[PDB]
Design a protein around this nucleic acid. Structure first.
Ligand SMILES: [Mg+2]
Lengths: 67, 609, 339
RNA sequence: GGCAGACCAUACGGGUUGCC
């Protein structure tokens, strides 16, 4: 008797973990889409990748006075 | 002029490892090497202060045993006690044990002064000094200096340009004896140069190999009653053994000058050979050639032994041949299919002793002799083995405790203290039908090697100190100039670096362009630098397949098998360097590449056909 | 037969927990997104040429002040560069050449890293002098150090090759709590912006969420076929995505508790090394094996463009906090920037 | 018987051809 109760504690630790994850209330797929679609569309205006910003405002191109 | 120049500190990290894998890397096996004592004292005295008192202690114990008389031994025993033993218990920093002190205590009030009086302490001097002191020495710049010296030991390979010959002093057999000098330092040695083409002619290749092999085992610890070999080498047309050199002459030549010899005269001289014989018998060798003509003398006049020639090993395989000078033979060697041992020398010795008295050779003895000498030479020259001396169990000691050597002590003879009875003064084309074969040059490997010890002495007397400082003199002016140029703490400082050193790569396997750079080994890479920069050239261990050695225009060099369908070039300065790279080099990459498979991020992409 | 009473009560749990997910799931993102405007082809230009590291580069990290970064490389050194000028601020060698991950503090004052030293090594940039020195040595895990991420200049969390993460207190150098849960070796971990939550991946092919303060797992995410190399978080603190040696990427929501979108083109065989979102979040970038990242319309899952320029495996990447440009760590020993 | 040569020893002088 050694690995009998060793795998049991692990198997019991599993059912503890399974019941933990099942507890949470969930939300439908349409709810997440809009929240984060709207988030993307809310902050899409202020993206320097999506909005290719002017050469001057861009440092790695040509921003003037540094140091 | 020519003078040999040391390597650099860089070797330490390379060398240190070289030794560690052998085992000659402890208190004893460094100290033993008298240099490894010298640099130890140079360290222990000048830098460490707990060691200094045990060194002047130890040095003055050697200057007690090596003293002349026994009456003057007490004068120095009182000089010692009051200080080196007493003083340390007054400051109470004497760590030495009870029974250690109670031996010297009881016997220095009893006053009896045998040389093994202070011996139980000498082992405790060792005892304490190998603890930390030894370790903390290792971490010294002198310990470094050693490595620098020791490399030069394993780099030493000899030529004929290195030597400055003066005269000639012998012809016989395969070659001729030259009285040589070492131009690097400056001392007289004996070159026994041989002409290679005459050995294949006579077919004396068994005896030539033998005469080499014997010199080594004999020439181990210093013994001034045997002309010891120092260095050995071969060149495409010559072969030479480098040994000690002496002026005097031989006993056959001075038997011509003086004539017959006295009792107290021969006693001294005869005592010289017995210890030479002891040194031969203790390491299992027989000379098989005991003769007055084959014995030399130096500027002082003390004696040694010459042409080994016929000396063959009795170590394990006894030779049953009829070998020897036709005259000084025992009745054992003469017989066909019968073995013998040291008896062959002891008989030849007694045969020689007669000739050093009368002048010829014939058992019966004369009239006007002394009582003790009859009992001696009858024992030496007895036909049986069991009845003869030196062949019962002891060997050399049966000669020692004889009534002839009764007045004389066996420790003073040992040091050339007894004076010499009299002083010596100081005022071709036969073989042109044999060529250089390739089956001949195959058996010349395993020939050229130098004695670790005998060389270490060569420097000790000559120019160790004047070089020591002169290299130090430039080790400062180097780092001084290195500082002037803005310093760099040696790259491989605090990291997990293993070792580093020097090597020469050819820039690309195509041109004839050698560039030499400095290298740093790592667990996962190899970098290297030139004269000034910090590394900009690189090689991983992932990038490597395997590593072999190879001959390059007769030079053993390193191949660096590349993963990307190519190869790389290398070369070293000294011989051993090459090695210690290879060992941890071969391991580092394999263990590097071993654990590449176990990691998911670091791995090579899995193969997919 | 209690081991049997647990296993048969697990298959019923697995199938019933997954029915709770699929009872919620009726429509997909592709349906949600198909309506809105497309991205258009975003094709950037190389800007900077960071000659520096000689050996292969692994993990990097972005300086919070959007002009600096620390980059780890096999060469046994960690470099800090000025992205604007092309000047190497400082060059530092590690005590152990087995490096894997590098990090950068939020303040931009202290820094951490490590690898097969099985240790997170940490330093200070500006001591009471200027010469850079080791601050502390962190040990605990038996295996290697996969990745490490800061809380502030007093706490931090790592991930290791003994299949566990751990929180650390800088002051002491002791584990605040421990995060046992993964069976496979842990690889990449991602911080929450709020810094009270975190997610991580492993070789078992699962993603797990973790309550930071407590010290336990909250959710299990199954889907990926092969080893899960990369991971990153969405700005709002309730969404994240990952890359893998399967040669696909996936997206996940937390309240909803499942996979959302798969990013699988049929002309893609090689794996991802580390992934990252944009500021807006719509853009996802995967550290591909073919020496260039591909952009993804994280909404529709269409390929936007590629950053061809490297000549060897792309090991990692990152965005500036202000979304200005993109770094790229690669095995060709180079770091280029794109905008 | 002496000398000379051959064979060998050679950091050394002791062990079949020709000539009186
Ligand atoms: Mg000889």
């Amino acid at each position: 008797a050694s690995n009998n109760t060793a795998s049991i504690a692990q198997a019991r630790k599993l059912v503890e973990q399974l019941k933990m994850e099942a507890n949470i209330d969930r939300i439908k797929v349409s709810k997440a889409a809009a929240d984060l679609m709207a988030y993307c569309e809310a902050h899409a205006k202020e993206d320097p990748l999506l909005t290719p910003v002017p050469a001057s405002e861009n440092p790695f191109r040509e921003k003037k006075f540094f140091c | 002029s020519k003078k040999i120049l040391l390597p650099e500190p860089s070797i330490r990290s390379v060398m240190q490892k070289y030794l560690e894998d052998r085992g000659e890397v402890t208190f004893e096996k460094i100290f033993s090497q008298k240099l490894g004592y010298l640099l130890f004292r140079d360290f222990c005295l000048k830098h460490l202060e707990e060691a200094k008192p045990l060194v002047e202690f130890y040095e003055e114990i050697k200057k007690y045993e090596k003293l002349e008389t026994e009456e003057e031994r007490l004068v120095c025993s009182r000089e010692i006690f009051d200080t080196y033993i007493m003083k340390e218990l007054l400051a109470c920093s004497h760590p030495f044990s009870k029974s250690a002190i109670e031996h010297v205590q009881g016997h220095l009030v009893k006053k009896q002064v045998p040389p093994d009086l202070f011996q139980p302490y000498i082992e405790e001097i060792c005892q304490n000094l190998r603890g930390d002191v030894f370790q903390k020495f290792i971490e010294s710049d002198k310990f470094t200096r050693f490595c620098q010296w020791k490399n030069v030991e394993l780099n030493i390979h000899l030529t004929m340009n290195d030597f400055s010959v003066h005269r000639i002093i012998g012809r016989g057999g395969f070659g001729e004896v030259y009285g040589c000098r070492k131009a690097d330092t400056g001392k007289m040695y004996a070159m026994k140069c041989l002409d290679k083409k005459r050995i294949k002619m006579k077919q004396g290749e068994t005896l030539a190999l033998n005469e080499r092999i014997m010199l080594s085992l004999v020439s181990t610890g210093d013994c001034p009653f045997i002309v010891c070999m120092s260095y050995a080498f071969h060149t495409p047309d010559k072969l030479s053994f480098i040994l000690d050199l002496m002026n005097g002459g031989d006993l056959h030549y001075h038997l011509s000058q003086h004539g017959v010899f006295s009792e107290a005269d021969m006693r001294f001289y005869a005592a010289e050979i017995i210890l030479g014989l002891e040194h031969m018998h203790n390491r299992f060798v027989v000379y098989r050639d005991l003769k007055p003509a084959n014995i030399l003398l130096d500027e002082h006049g003390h004696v040694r032994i010459s042409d080994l020639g016929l000396a063959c090993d009795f170590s394990k395989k006894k030779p049953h041949a009829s070998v020897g000078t036709h005259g000084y033979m025992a009745p054992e060697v003469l017989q066909k299919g019968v073995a013998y041992d040291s008896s062959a020398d002891w008989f030849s010795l007694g045969c020689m002793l007669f000739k050093l008295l009368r002048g010829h050779s014939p058992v019966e003895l004369p009239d006007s002799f002394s009582p003790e000498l009859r009992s001696l030479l009858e024992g030496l020259l007895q036909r049986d083995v069991n009845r003869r001396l030196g062949c019962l169990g002891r060997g050399a000691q049966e000669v020692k405790e004889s009534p002839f050597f009764r007045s004389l002590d066996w420790q003073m003879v040992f040091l050339q203290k007894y004076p010499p009875p009299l002083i010596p003064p100081r005022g071709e084309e036969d073989t042109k039908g044999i060529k250089l074969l390739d089956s001949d040059q195959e058996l010349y490997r395993n020939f050229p090697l130098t004695i670790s010890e005998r060389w270490q002495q060569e420097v000790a007397e000559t120019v160790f100190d004047t070089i020591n400082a002169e290299t130090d003199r430039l080790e400062a002016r180097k780092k001084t100039k290195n500082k002037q140029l803005g310093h760099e703490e040696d790259y491989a400082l605090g990291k997990d670096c293993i070792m580093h050193g020097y090597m020469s790569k050819m820039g690309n396997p195509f041109l004839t362009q050698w560039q030499r750079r400095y290298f740093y080994l790592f667990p996962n890479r190899l970098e290297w630098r030139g004269e000034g920069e910090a590394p900009q050239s690189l090689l991983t261990m992932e990038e490597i397949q395997s590593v072999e050695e190879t001959q390059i225009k007769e030079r053993k060099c390193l191949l660096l098998k590349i993963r990307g369908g190519k190869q790389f070039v290398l070369q070293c300065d000294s011989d051993p360097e090459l090695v210690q790279w290879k060992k941890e080099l071969r391991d580092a990459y394999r263990e590097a590449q071993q654990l590449v498979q176990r990691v998911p991020k670091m791995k090579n992409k899995p193969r997919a056909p | 037969s209690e081991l049997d009473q647990l296993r048969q009560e697990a298959e019923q749990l697995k199938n019933q927990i997954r029915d709770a997910r699929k009872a919620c799931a009726d429509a997909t993102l592709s349906q949600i997104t198909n309506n809105i405007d497309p991205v258009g082809r975003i094709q950037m230009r190389t800007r900077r040429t960071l000659r520096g590291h000689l050996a292969k580069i692994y993990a990097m990290h972005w300086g919070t002040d959007s002009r600096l970064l620390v980059s780890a490389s096999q060469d046994g050194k960690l470099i800090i560069w000025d992205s604007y000028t092309t000047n190497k601020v400082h060059a530092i060698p590690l005590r152990s050449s087995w490096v894997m991950t590098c990090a950068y503090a939020p303040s931009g004052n202290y820094v951490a890293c490590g690898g097969l030293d099985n240790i997170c090594s940490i330093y200070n940039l500006k001591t009471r002098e200027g010469n850079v020195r080791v601050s502390r040595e962190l040990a605990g895990h038996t295996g290697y150090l996969s990745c490490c991420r800061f809380l502030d200049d007093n706490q931090i969390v790592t991930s290791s090759g003994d299949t566990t993460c751990a929180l650390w207190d800088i002051e002491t150098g002791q584990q605040t709590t421990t995060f046992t849960g993964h069976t496979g070796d842990v690889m990449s971990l991602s911080l929450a912006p709020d810094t009270r939550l975190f997610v991580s991946g492993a070789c078992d092919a699962s993603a797990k969420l973790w309550d930071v303060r407590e010290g336990m797992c909250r959710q299990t995410f199954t889907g990926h076929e092969s080893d899960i190399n990369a991971i990153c978080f969405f700005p709002n603190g309730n969404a994240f995505a990952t890359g893998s040696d399967d040669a696909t990427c996936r997206l996940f929501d937390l309240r909803a508790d499942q996979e959302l979108m798969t990013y699988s083109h049929d002309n893609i065989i090689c794996g991802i090394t580390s992934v990252s979102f944009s500021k807006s979040g719509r853009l996802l970038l995967a550290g591909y094996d073919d020496f260039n990242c591909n952009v993804w319309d994280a909404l529709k899952a269409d390929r936007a463009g590629v950053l061809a320029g490297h000549d060897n495996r792309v090991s990692c990447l990152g965005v500036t906090d202000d979304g200005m440009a993109v770094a790229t760590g690669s095995w060709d020993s180079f770091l280029k920037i794109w905008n």
